[PDB]
């Protein structure tokens with residue numbers, strides 16, 4: 119038996135994510151779907167509207183076999199590091215394939231571009247050279263080099279988000295040396311975006327988005343809103359970011375991952391007079407910082423992650439551990455087969471390992487749950503250490519916990 | 520001009536404080552009352568019920584001519600350190616008189632006990648070490664070495680808080696040889712304890728205290744809760760203690776003022792499983808910590824005040840500046856008469872002067888607004904800067920700002 123990897127934030131799990139998990143198998147030919155998922159803070163820098171334990175329960179019912187956490191180390195990063203770490207994880211798990219979405223059903227222009235950029239990298243990087251000399255910025259210089267080779271209309275659209283993610287997936291397998299086959303199909307009960315679906319529940323109104331949500335999801339959601347009493351938004355953390363930037367020194371704020379040299383001063387001026395995450399971000403955005411990148415930096419400023427430590431962990435060539443959130447009986451079976459071949463530990467309960475990348479995952483949790491009104495917060499906190507992998511039986515509805 | 524020094528924290532200012540301010544000017548023959556008081560976080564360790572700005576106005580309308588902030592540096596401290604710098608600042612302002620209420624209306628056992636203990640201070644450390652070398656503990660060997668004297672019928676229980684602080688103002692004066700004469704009287708439309716009042720306001724009673732609280736003071740409290748929607752309590756900050764203990768390693772928390780070696784692990788461990796600030800404490804209790812010492816510590820954790828910060832600042836034998844919060848007609852002329860005499864910065868606008876001890880007070884003023892809901896909180900943080908030091912017209916009630 120053979121495995122198809124999916125890189126997913128599942129924010130939340132909806133019918134579209136279903137179209138992914140089912141097409142993957144049919145198109146690749148693998149009877150096993152393994153997803154590596156961003157746990158509590160995602161690639162664009164925002165918190166998951168629900169815990170990674172809940173979203174696991176949803177995915178395990180909707181056709182994913184193994185749910186592995188994408189360590190925070192790799193998860194809050196722009197696409198290439200995100201892809202590098204997530205593709206390493208799928209590599210560790212011997213997935214025969216990688217199934218990623220774009221607005222194209224075709225895996226070809228991802229391929230053709232990759233080599234082109236793979237082979238021209240010298241020409242390219244020598245072409246970035248010449249341009250800085252003319253006094254242009256680096257993004258300028260980079261844009262000028264790309265366009266010489268890449269203005270041939272291939273045409274890979276490096277705008278459409280998930281295509282960028284596709285390119286870096288294909289990229290990472292290529293410089294990785296992984297025996298992995300990238301697949302893909304076109305994105306599209308017509309299906310809704312995860313975004314618009316989020317606004318729904320955020321408006322307290324989860325009823326709008328139901329037909330777009332698989333059944334298992336709605337309950338687990340309703341159960342999560344019933345269990346812990348909120349849905350999680352970025353504005354839930356503003357109060358704690360405001361504490362963070364209060365209790366730090368501009369020398370200390372310089373060392374937080376993604377705070378570039380000099381910005382820490384602008385950072386502190388803005389936060390004092392910022393009455394919302396919205397306003398704060400409004401005072402923050404620069405030419406040097408995209409919207410999303412600020413959400414990333416702000417999340418780091420939330421977990422108080424230092425550059426040096428982050429540099430330490432990125433230097434590792436492979437995922438430090440395999441963090442097991444959940445599994446079906448196929449998942450369990452696929453795992454126990456390959457487990458002996460896993461070269462890094464397999465974490466199910468947190469007492470089975472100690473690594474700096476994992477405290478980071480645990481810390482992210484302890485921060486993530488802050489919005490839950492006490493005592494309800496503390497019950498939640500028992501989960502990271504408490505919650506053992508969630509086990510579903512595809513012979514319907516058996517959770518064994 | 521003659522001024523009487525008042526060492527106070529008005530939380531709130533009650534009938535015991537109003538009587539204490541009028542008898543201050545009566546019994547000490549001074550035309551002016553100068554108060555040094557804790558701004559936002561106090562000696563007992565807890566947050567002020569209401570901002571230093573408003574509590575100032577319960578004082579100016581109750582007979583205090585001048586109000587200076589006791590910096591966090593001295594304010595949140597053991598009673599030996601607290602008394603020292605309060606007295607230090609009142610002597611800086613050239614107060615010729617000091618006035619404190621007490622469980623012992625008698626200064627004489629205070630001047631006795633003080634003059635008594637130094638006469639023997641060699642006899643003590645010997646009986647201490649003689650107990651110490653015999654395996655006795657610190658407070659035991661001291662309680663034995665101290666009960667080797669003083670233990671006559673005199674009482675003056677220094678098991679009583681007022682006698683403790685009172686002995687400590689007097690000690691700082693004698694040991695300092697200040698030209699400032701100390702005064703005391705016993706503790707007695709009515710009069711209650713600020714604490715039994717406080718717990719009465721937490722018990723959803725305000726006008727209940729109107730028997731036990733003056734007009735201005737009661738006028739001032741309502742308009743606060745009106746604007747910011749709260750009275751500040753220790754629990755209110757619990758979420759920020761969780762959050763702050765959730766980012767910090769053992770080593771770094773180890774470096775926090777008043778965190779004893781190895782107590783970090785217990786703290787980090789205890790905060791996890793505590794769904795209440797009260798629960799957080801019981802777990803933390805070890806005989807080397809009183810409850811106040813544990814409350815004082817939770818403050819230094821919140822504000823992230825470090826041992827090296829503190830000891831470096833505690834070391835000096837003078838006060839770093841005079842922060843002026845507010846004043847009367849009388850108070851102004853006194854500040855104008857003694858202005859040129861101050862050997863340290865008179866800080867009216869915060870803009871004028873920056874000092875690490877000053878950095879500390881503002882950091883505490885930012886931590887103080889945190890339970891306040893925005894947009895109010897963002898505006899509350901305006902007060903530490905663009906607030907003209909308050910001024911009030913003694914004769915027929917006018918604030919000039």
Ligand SMILES: Nc1ncnc2c1ncn2[C@@H]1O[C@H](COP(=O)(O)OP(=O)(O)OP(=O)(O)O)[C@@H](O)[C@H]1O
Nearest residue numbers: 126127128134135138218219305306309311312313
């Ligand atoms: N309707 C859909 N059609 C095709 N692929 C989908 C669909 N919904 C999700 N996927 C795929 O599922 C995987 C995980 O999705 P993820 O949680 O990252 O959402 P997303 O596609 O980024 O959301 P959005 O569509 O709002 O941009 C990705 O490979 C994604 O392309």
Ligand SMILES: Nc1ncnc2c1ncn2[C@@H]1O[C@H](COP(=O)(O)OP(=O)(O)OP(=O)(O)O)[C@@H](O)[C@H]1O
Nearest residue numbers: 527528529535536619620621705706707712713714
């Ligand atoms: N009712 C009272 N009788 C006598 N002295 C008082 C009274 N209230 C306050 N004082 C004195 O006024 C001084 C300033 O007190 P502070 O503002 O520190 O409050 P406190 O003494 O902690 O409160 P409490 O009055 O509840 O003990 C203290 O030294 C205290 O002894």
